């Protein structure tokens, strides 16, 4: 019987202030 | 006959006698098991805990 005895929270400011960048490019790829 | 054979083989017969006389050192041992070697039992619950 002794024997026995032993047995995210995410920032939604952030993600859109860091993919802005990224957001933007294919319309800078286009010019305007 | 009575002292010559008769006192040894008495002394043979009460052989008899010191099977328990002997034997009780036999039992006076497991009568010290009965304390002494379940204390070798007793830790290996400290084997287990």
């Known amino acids: 019987d002794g024997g026995g005895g032993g047995g995210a929270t995410i920032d939604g400011r952030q993600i859109s202030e860091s993919t802005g960048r990224y957001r933007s490019d294919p319309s ?5 | 006959d009575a002292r010559e054979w008769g006192t040894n083989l008495i002394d043979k017969f ?5 099977s328990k006389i002997s034997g009780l050192r036999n039992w006076l041992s497991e009568l010290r098991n009965i304390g002494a070697e379940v204390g070798i039992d007793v830790p290996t619950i400290g084997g287990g805990g």
């Open chain 1, 28 to 32: 800078r790829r286009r010019g305007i």
């Open chain 2, 14 to 18: 009460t052989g008899g006698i010191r």
